[PDB]
């Protein structure tokens, strides 16, 4: 299980949002440590990344933009894996310190996206996903999003895709339905993170306006990436179109 082993050894730890549970929820304090927290995952997400097999192999201008594009849906993927796990799907654990409820997916106005994410925490277990089953889904996560016009190396990037593919064929192997279920699954976490990028942006535009903190690193992301990810210029590669 060579392949496998490296999912397993680089897979990130526990990453906590710094949120205060004390005080009384507030839509500025909970997206004020939601945006935190993305910050954290995003490093989590680059230095995992960069520790993948064949991916430092990428230009390093094709590794900052894949990482970028990628991110939400990434962050979703794990997010509703660890709900599923920690706490049977029944609320989101963002983080230790950050689980919501339905009264803080209602505060944080993300009710709608938050009520999707769940429903994908529930399809881990009403297709019993396996442990390695998901982490060749997530690696394969960070392939799914790209330009339109292609990649500075697009080729060598084919050729990883089409290797990750034929991994998570492998962790399986009517295997054929297991997989359709699998790649049906990892194409449904792209409308929830097109959502989630709806909402990030919107929120951008307008905070200063509303209290909220944006980290640095986050605002480039929101207004350099996301738009173009809102904008069709990026678009997911799709297992059934769609
Ligand atoms: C940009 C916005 C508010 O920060 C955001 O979506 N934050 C955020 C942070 C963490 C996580 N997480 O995966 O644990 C997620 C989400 F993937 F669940 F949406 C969003």
């Given at each position: 299980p060579i392949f496998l082993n490296v999912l397993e050894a680089i897979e990130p730890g526990v990453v906590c949002?710094?949120?205060?549970?004390n005080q009384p929820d507030s839509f500025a304090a909970l997206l004020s440590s939601l945006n935190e927290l993305g910050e954290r995952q995003l490093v989590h997400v680059v230095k995992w990344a960069k520790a993948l097999?064949?991916?430092?192999?990428?230009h390093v201008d094709d590794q900052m933009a894949v990482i970028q594009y990628s991110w939400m849906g990434l962050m979703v993927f794990a997010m509703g894996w660890r709900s599923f796990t920690n706490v049977?799907?029944?609320?989101?654990?963002?983080?230790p310190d950050l689980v919501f409820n339905e009264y803080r997916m209602h505060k944080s106005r993300m009710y709608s996206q938050c009520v999707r994410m769940r429903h994908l925490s529930q399809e881990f277990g009403w297709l019993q996903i396996t442990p390695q089953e998901f982490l060749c889904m997530k690696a394969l996560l960070l392939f799914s999003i790209i330009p339109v016009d292609g990649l500075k190396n697009q080729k060598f990037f084919d050729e990883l895709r089409m290797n990750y593919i034929k991994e998570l064929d492998r962790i399986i192997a009517s295997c054929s339905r297991r997989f359709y279920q699998l790649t049906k699954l990892l194409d449904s976490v792209q409308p929830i993170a097109r959502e989630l990028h709806q909402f990030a942006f919107d929120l951008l535009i307008k905070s200063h306006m509303v209290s909220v903190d944006f980290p640095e690193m986050m605002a480039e992301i929101i207004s350099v990436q996301v738009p173009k990810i809102l904008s069709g210029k990026v678009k997911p590669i799709y297992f059934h179109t769609q």
């Open positions: 949002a710094g949120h205060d549970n097999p064949g991916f430092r192999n990428l049977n799907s029944a609320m989101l654990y963002f983080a």
